[PDB]
Design a protein around this ligand. Structure first.
Ligand code: CDL
Ligand code: CDL
Ligand code: PLX
Ligand code: PLX
Ligand code: PEE
Ligand code: PEE
Ligand code: 8Q1
Lengths: 124, 459, 103, 55, 70, 178, 84, 88, 128, 55
């Protein structure tokens, strides 16, 4: 989707574009500003040589999945707990990306509202 | 080198004192033996050359052409053995004498450390060819073809003599080693432009360049089989060899004097490839194919880059062998059919399967199929021209597509389909023709294993 | 419309001749004559002269000629994970930092 | 859970959720619908009706 | 390699029991495989992780201030 | 293919050919047998309603809109028999038809096999050798002055005579030589 | 070894329009006042084993019953074995 | 392929089988030498329909110039045999 | 009424839709008779020359030889320089050459200018 | 089992100045996976052709 229909049929500036996001400082929302944690260092991820696109925040579960697949080779479906854990972590990452999109949308909504209120007050 | 020139000379008394029914056997055996002797020349070194003496020297450009020239003569004898059955002994001996003289002149030409000797033998190669074309030719147009072949060549090559003697007067020597070592730039002047034109046109007319190729279809169509193969295989390479030898003194003028010839060749390759599609004759089609390939070689030589020279040499050898094979096959068809028309005899693959196999292999090689040396030379020239300018790829790709089209058209029209009903003299192919095709094709598939032997001095 | 009598007669005679010719095309029992002259097991020999010998030749060629020159056969280095042990050195790769594990 | 599923289902899923051209999306969806349609055509016209071959 | 089957000329052709039982067995095998995989692996078609609803997300965790602070 | 053609087609022949083409394309359109029979009967009904028309100007006026209607609904992909000039296997076996005269070029070692076949071959060749001499004279005396008007050949009239120009019609290779 | 057994064609009186959907064609031709001369010629396409046809959906589930029975048996066996 | 070598008697049997199912003609009156226009009183369109029926039944199609001049079952059998190169 | 079939060069008018053979006159029948007569004369000559047991060669076809001679060796003697022929020759034999020369000259001039300015990034261009 | 990858450059065809052309085979995931599929399909097709093209 509905967001595409809203953007190409409603007001373009009303909600963002994927290319230029984010358009607001990360500290605008809250001041604590917790940092994302990475549990796989450069060197072990390099040795596992996953992929350039696979070296994301969910890399440790991928490395465990590769270890499990390599260890129990003949029984190709021996290890599924770590496969599900990696899927869960990727799902959480997608949820966080959705959170970013909706946060930017609502921040732009409030920015437009603030600008309209200021313009109305100046005119009044 | 005399270990090669002397036996070729002794071939003449050997032929003339042979028995009336044993000339072909002796000529073939000793020609093959001579070819084996010529094989030793192929082992070139990365340094200057094999400077045998003050008169003859061998390079890695002259070695492949010399080996091909010495190898061609037995094939010419086996090809001519067919239509000379009803000929008197004296005339057959004269024919073999002309072939031997042609080989001797070519052998002396390809080394020729001095440019005036090179020119003298380069024009001497013209008399036996003219005699062969105008004497042992079937059609009544052999006379006009001989006149065209003589005059087109001589008009171009006459200013070359004046240019050479002028260069000797100013430079002081025409030895190729001294010419290469003491080379100096040519200033941009009208006199130097005309010197460039005189030194280049003589070799461009023989290659031939598009627009001066009118003599080639006539000479190839009206000549006998042996004349056709010696024209398509070796006599066309004289111009390119001379051009690659003589472009050492024309710099840096060539950098802008090559534009008309480059444009003419890059458009004439397309024009002649298209012409091949709509052809009612086989020998004419093969002649136009030769014109297209030689135009590509002209482009390569005029680019003047190491890859250009390597590709030019490879294409020279490959095209020589392929055109000789194609002319052989066309002659074998014409001997049974007696018509020389593409659509008159059809579906010959059902009647002659092995000749159909030879036709397929020759067409595939002409089609520039990898990893044959045809495609090696083709691709080297393509990459060099792409480095010269990125837009040449359009013309070269168009030429490649049209080449494939007309090659497979030639194969399909004469081999596939339903046989013609009113022809009942298609006798089974002799052992001579099969052996001729095998000896034509096996060296190509063998040279594809050792390309460095035919890649020229810039390897 | 229909066949004219001349057409009928010609077709009849042509048919008779065609049937005679076609019948003459048959081969008798002794018609084909060949002059004779001479100068698990199937799979067992097949696997020997078609599989084993090429394996031997190619293994020899790769082991003692191709690998003699440098860089001819280059193998991708095996993946190293936390916790494995290296044969050449014996050192043990340190494990992960115990990421929080729920579900 | 067939051989074509493990490929085509993932193809369509990945195509649906990428920053790609929309017309390509629509064309691919119509193409797979038509794929099902012509498979149906083959089966129905070659295996269902009454025989139509020579006696 | 096979058996002698003769033409019928407007009758149903002969059917050996071998081909009938073989075709039935392979169709049954396909359907059993599909059913077994659907029983064991239901998330491959229906999905396994719920799609979040963005409207239900409160402004607290989205860093939105009530239009007055900034 | 066998019958020689006439200089022109009569109106009856045109009508019959149009009827055959229309029925063929209707069968192509109507895949199933019952539908084809129903619509073929309907087409025959609409085809015979002008059977008894007398004047030729109106009949020629018809069979023109009929041809236009046929061309408009001609099923651009009609059904073609596999051996027809448009079929999938039209000239499939034309590469296996080797002419009879090729057997004259066989090596004697190859002719050692199949001796009876070659004996019958010699008998056929002798028969043709005499029959040709008879046929050339028969055709010379039978043709009218000024050259033949149609490409129809006369049969054999005497007892020992054979039809003129029979060798290459009788000795066709086969329908499926291999 | 080839197909040489001297096949015998059936009797021509067996083929009848009865029991085939050619009745509808004949009836609708008679309503407008004609008949189909070739009606019997194709009766063989609806007479013998070709009489019974299967719908598309029924064709798709060719072996549903056997597969379902085997699936139920396997699921029950797994349930009774894993619960141990 | 496994196609049986169809013979003359088989061809004649098939021709008569096709004709006897053409209800416009009575099976008892027809013979292998019976005509179509005169002995059976069939229309030209009817003859075209018989020719097309044999076309469909035998799997090969007859050219119009040869189909329009076949008037007896015997000559139809002869034409089919000549097309298919039948010995006996 | 039905939409009309409009013929073109590469899709000719069908014989059935052609109106020439529907306006039949006795002279048209005479013309068809003469055409069939000459065709049958040629066919009879060919068949007489074709079934001859004594012939052991290729039947020479005057039509094929005439076609080849007309295509190949009869073009120049019937050639005349006319404005149409001259214009077509000049265009088709000169225009492509100068077009390609201009294109290649412009491309090489641009490349040389970029080389002189040095902004081409010719790294790794070792082979040439 | 391991994730083996390998390239074999056994025969050195020819060297053109600074370029080397050699008979090199790449045996990565794609090649090692597509060899068996193609060979299996070809085996089935050849066995089918032994019956289809018997005449
Ligand atoms: C694939 C590799 C195989 C290697 C095995 C060894 C084979 C050695 C062959 C050497 C050359 C053949 C000689 C030419 C004349 C043939 C004599 C003849 O008359 O045949 C009758 C003879 C008996 O049949 P018959 O029933 O009596 O005659 C009936 C008719 O003749 C009816 O005849 P037909 O219907 O049976 O057809 C005849 C057949 C045979 O006729 C031919 O066309 C053969 C010529 C094909 C080449 C076409 C020119 C293109 C340039 C290629 C140059 C490569 C040469 C390498 C060095 C060669 C050394 C001599 O034609 C074809 O089958 C079509 C060929 C098209 C193939 C296209 C693919 C080419 C590139 C493939 C890769 C090559 C490099 C590999 C690099 C990477 C891998 C390591 O049949 C044969 O002998 C067939 C030979 C096998 C065909 C070889 C085709 C490919 C091999 C090319 C060279 C091998 C490269 C080395 C790799 C080794 C690993
Ligand atoms: C190397 C790779 C391949 C390249 C080689 C191939 C290509 C290059 C070589 C071939 C092309 C070169 C041809 C150019 C000159 C050749 C013309 C020639 O020889 O005249 C013989 C021929 C001898 O004249 P004639 O036999 O006494 O009169 C016969 C005509 O019926 C009488 O005609 P008319 O009197 O009715 O009309 C003539 C009049 C009218 O001209 C026109 O109709 C249109 C105007 C066209 C030219 C002006 C633009 O012309 C003018 O007034 C224009 C004069 C400027 O002259 C002509 O028939 C052609 C006249 C028009 C000249 C057009 C040439 C211009 C081409 C571009 C430069
Ligand atoms: C198991 C082995 C495998 C490899 C076999 C390779 C065999 C190669 C044979 C082919 C050789 C090709 C001909 C080479 C000719 C070029 C060299 C030749 O010109 O050299 C001459 C010498 O040639 C030989 O003396 C004669 C060789 C001729 C015969 C070659 C063998 C095959 C001949 C077959 C002929 C027919 C056989 C019988 C048929 C019935 C003169 O040498 P010279 O310039 O002084 O040397 C100076 C340097 N020195 C002082 C160190 C010597
Ligand atoms: C037909 C089939 C093919 C045959 C062979 C074709 C190849 C021959 C073409 C000749 C190649 C080029 C010739 C001259 C090249 C020099 C560049 C010149 O043409 O361009 C301008 C030259 O201006 C004019 O072109 C002057 C010449 C004009 C007269 C020449 C005739 C032009 C048309 C004739 C065509 C006939 C060709 C075939 C003859 C049979 C540049 O002016 P400018 O920078 O100041 O002078 C440069 C030279 N400098 C530096 C030494 C001073
Ligand atoms: C066969 C019967 C004998 C079996 C026992 C012998 C088994 C192998 C033992 C031989 C020793 C190995 C050997 O042959 O020597 C290496 C030798 C080359 O010597 P190098 O020095 O390494 O390179 C050339 C430059 N000097 O290698 C070989 O020639 C043998 C293997 C080469 C591959 C086989 C040929 C396949 C390709 C044919 C050519 C195709 C065209 C070119 C391909 C284009 C590639 C871009
Ligand atoms: C298939 C037919 C091809 C015909 C080819 C003919 C054209 C060849 C090119 C011109 C040939 C003549 C060139 C002269 C030979 C070179 C000698 C030389 O370079 O000396 C020059 C002399 O240059 C000349 O004399 C050239 C005069 C040319 C007269 C003849 C003209 C022939 C036709 C000219 C146009 C042809 C060009 C294109 C031909 C294309 C092919 C048709 C130096 O003069 P110096 O006295 O040393 O002065 C130094 C002090 N300042
Ligand atoms: C899907 C494609 C649809 C195509 C539709 C085509 C159009 C259908 C409608 C055609 C309209 C006509 O009938 S056009 C009518 C053409 N004019 C005549 O028929 C006048 C006299 N007819 C004859 O003489 C014939 O020979 C005849 C008696 C028929 C047989 O004779 P036979 O005794 O020798 O069988």
């Amino acid at each position: 989707g509905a967001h595409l229909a809203r953007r190409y049929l409603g007001d373009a500036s009303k909600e963002p574009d994927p290319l230029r996001m984010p358009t607001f400082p990360p500290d605008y929302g809250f001041p604590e500003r917790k940092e994302r944690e990475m549990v796989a260092t450069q060197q072990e991820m390099n040795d596992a040589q996953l992929m350039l696109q696979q070296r994301d925040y969910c890399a440790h579960y991928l490395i465990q999945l590769l270890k499990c697949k390599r260890d129990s080779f003949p029984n190709f479906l021996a290890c599924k707990h770590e496969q599900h854990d990696w899927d869960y972590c990727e799902h959480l990452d997608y949820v966080k990306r959705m959170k970013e999109f909706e946060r930017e949308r609502r921040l732009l909504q409030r920015k437009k509202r603030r600008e309209q209120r200021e313009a109305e007050m100046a005119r009044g | 080198m005399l270990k090669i020139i002397i036996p070729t000379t002794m071939l003449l008394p050997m032929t003339w004192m042979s028995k009336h029914n044993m000339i072909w056997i002796n000529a073939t055996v000793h020609s093959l033996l001579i070819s084996l002797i010529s094989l030793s020349l192929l082992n070139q070194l990365g340094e200057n050359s094999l400077n045998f003496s003050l008169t003859f020297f061998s390079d890695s450009l002259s070695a492949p052409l010399l080996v091909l020239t010495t190898w061609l003569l037995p094939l010419m004898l086996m090809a001519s053995q067919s239509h000379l059955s009803k000929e008197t002994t004296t005339r057959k001996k004269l024919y073999i004498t002309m072939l031997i003289l042609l080989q001797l002149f070519l052998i002396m030409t390809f080394t020729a450390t001095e440019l005036i000797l090179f020119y003298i033998l380069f024009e001497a190669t013209l008399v036996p060819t003219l005699i062969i074309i105008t004497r042992w030719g079937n059609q009544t147009e052999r006379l006009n073809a001989g006149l065209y072949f003589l005059f087109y060549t001589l008009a171009g090559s006459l200013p070359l003599l004046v240019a050479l003697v002028y260069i000797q007067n100013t430079t002081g020597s025409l030895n190729f080693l001294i010419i290469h070592y003491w080379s100096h730039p040519l200033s941009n002047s009208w006199s130097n432009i005309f010197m460039w034109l005189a030194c280049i046109m003589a070799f461009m007319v023989k290659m031939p360049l598009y627009g001066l190729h009118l003599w080639l279809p006539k000479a190839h169509v009206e000549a006998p089989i042996a004349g056709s193969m010696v024209l398509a295989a070796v006599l066309l390479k004289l111009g390119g060899y001379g051009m690659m030898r003589i472009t050492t003194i024309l710099n840096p003028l060539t950098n802008y004097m090559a534009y008309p010839f480059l444009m003419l060749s890059m458009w004439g390759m397309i024009m002649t490839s298209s012409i091949c599609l709509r052809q009612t004759d086989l020998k004419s089609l093969i002649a136009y194919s030769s014109v297209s390939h030689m135009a590509l070689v002209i482009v390569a030589i005029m680019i003047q880059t190491p890859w250009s020279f390597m590709g030019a040499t490879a294409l020279m050898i490959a095209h020589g062998l392929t055109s000789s094979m194609l002319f052989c096959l066309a002659n074998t068809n014409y001997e049974r059919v007696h018509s020389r028309t593409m659509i008159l005899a059809r579906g010959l693959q059902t009647l002659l399967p092995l000749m159909a196999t030879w036709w397929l292999v020759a067409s595939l090689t002409n089609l520039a199929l990898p990893p044959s040396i045809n495609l090696i030379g083709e691709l080297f020239i393509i990459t060099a021209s792409f480095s010269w300018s990125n837009i040449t790829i359009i013309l070269m790709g168009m030429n490649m597509m049209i080449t494939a089209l007309y090659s497979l058209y030639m194969l399909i029209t004469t081999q596939r389909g339903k046989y013609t009903h009113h022809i009942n003299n298609i006798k089974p192919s002799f052992t001579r023709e099969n052996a001729l095709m095998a000896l034509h094709i096996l060296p190509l598939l063998l040279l594809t294993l050792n390309p460095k032997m035919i890649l020229g001095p810039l390897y | 419309s229909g066949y004219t009598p001349d057409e009928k007669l010609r077709l009849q005679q042509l048919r008779e001749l065609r049937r005679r010719w076609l019948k003459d095309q048959e081969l008798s029992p002794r018609e084909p004559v060949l002059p004779p002259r001479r100068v698990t097991y199937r799979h067992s020999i097949f696997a020997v002269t078609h599989v084993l010998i090429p394996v031997w030749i190619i293994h020899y060629y790769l082991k003692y000629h191709v690998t003699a020159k440098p860089y001819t056969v280059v193998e991708r280095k095996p993946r190293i994970f936390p916790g494995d042990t290296i044969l050449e050195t014996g050192e043990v790769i340190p494990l992960m930092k115990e990421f929080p594990d729920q579900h | 859970y067939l051989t074509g599923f493990y490929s085509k289902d993932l193809i369509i899923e990945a195509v649906n959720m990428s920053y790609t051209n929309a017309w390509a999306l629509l064309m691919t969806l119509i193409a797979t619908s038509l794929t099902a349609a012509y498979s149906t055509r083959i089966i129905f016209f070659a295996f269902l009706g009454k025989p139509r071959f020579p006696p | 390699g096979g058996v002698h089957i003769e033409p019928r000329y407007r009758q149903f052709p002969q059917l050996t029991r071998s081909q009938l039982i073989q075709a039935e067995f392979f169709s049954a095998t396909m359907w059993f495989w599909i059913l077994w995989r659907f029983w064991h692996d239901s998330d491959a078609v229906l999905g396994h992780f719920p799609y979040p609803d963005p409207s239900q997300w409160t402004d607290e965790e989205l860093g939105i201030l009530p239009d007055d602070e900034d | 293919a066998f019958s020689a053609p006439a200089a022109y087609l009569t109106h009856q022949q045109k009508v019959l050919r149009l009827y055959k083409r229309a029925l063929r394309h209707l069968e192509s359109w109507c895949v199933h047998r019952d539908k084809y029979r129903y619509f073929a009967c309907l087409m025959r009904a609409r085809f015979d309603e002008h059977k008894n028309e007398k004047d030729m100007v109106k009949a020629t006026q018809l069979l023109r809109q009929a041809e236009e209607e046929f061309w408009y609904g001609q099923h651009p992909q009609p059904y073609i028999f596999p051996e027809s000039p448009g079929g999938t296997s039209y000239e499939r076996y034309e590469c296996y038809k080797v002419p009879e005269w090729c057997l004259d070029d066989w090596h004697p070692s190859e002719k050692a096999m199949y001796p009876d076949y070659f004996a019958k071959r010699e008998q056929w060749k002798r028969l043709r050798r005499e029959s040709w001499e008879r046929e050339v004279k028969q055709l010379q005396e039978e043709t009218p002055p000024g050259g033949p008007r149609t490409e129809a050949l006369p049969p054999a009239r005497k007892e020992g005579d054979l039809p003129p120009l029979w060798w290459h019609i009788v000795t066709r290779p086969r329908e499926r030589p291999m | 070894e080839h197909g040489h057994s001297k096949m015998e064609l059936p009797d021509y009186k067996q083929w009848k329009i009865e029991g085939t959907p050619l009745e509808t064609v004949q009836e609708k031709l008679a309503a407008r006042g004609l008949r189909d001369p070739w009606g019997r010629n194709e009766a063989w396409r609806y007479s013998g084993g070709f009489a019974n046809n299967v719908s598309f959906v029924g064709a798709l589930l060719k072996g549903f019953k056997w597969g379902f029975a085997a699936f139920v048996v396997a699921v029950g066996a797994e349930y009774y074995l894993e619960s141990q | 392929s496994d196609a049986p070598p169809l013979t003359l008697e088989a061809i004649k049997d098939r021709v008569l089988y096709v004709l006897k199912l053409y209800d416009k003609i009575d099976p008892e009156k027809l013979s292998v030498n019976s005509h179509f226009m005169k002995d059976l009183g069939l229309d030209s369109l009817d003859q075209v329909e018989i020719i097309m029926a044999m076309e469909d039944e035998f799997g090969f199609e007859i050219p119009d110039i040869d189909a329009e001049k076949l008037m007896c079952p015997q000559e139809i059998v002869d034409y089919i045999a000549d097309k298919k190169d039948v010995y006996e | 009424s039905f939409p009309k079939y409009k013929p073109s060069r590469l899709a000719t008018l069908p014989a059935t839709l052609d109106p020439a053979e529907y306006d039949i006159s006795p002279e048209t029948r005479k013309a068809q008779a003469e055409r069939l007569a000459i065709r049958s004369r040629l066919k009879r000559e060919y068949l007489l020359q074709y079934n001859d047991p004594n012939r052991l060669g290729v039947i020479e076809d005057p039509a094929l030889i005439r076609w080849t001679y007309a295509r190949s060796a009869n073009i120049y003697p019937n050639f005349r320089p006319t404005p149409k022929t001259s214009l077509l020759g000049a265009l088709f034999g000169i225009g492509p050459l100068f077009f390609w020369y201009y294109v290649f000259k412009t491309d090489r001039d641009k490349k040389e200018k970029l080389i002189q300015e040095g902004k081409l990034d010719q790294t790794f261009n070792i082979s040439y | 089992h391991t994730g083996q990858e390998m390239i074999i450059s056994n025969w050195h065809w020819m060297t053109l100045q600074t370029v080397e052309l050699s008979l090199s085979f790449k045996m990565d995931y794609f090649s090692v996976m597509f060899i068996p599929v193609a060979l299996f399909v070809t085996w089935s097709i050849m066995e089918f052709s032994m019956w289809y093209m018997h005449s």
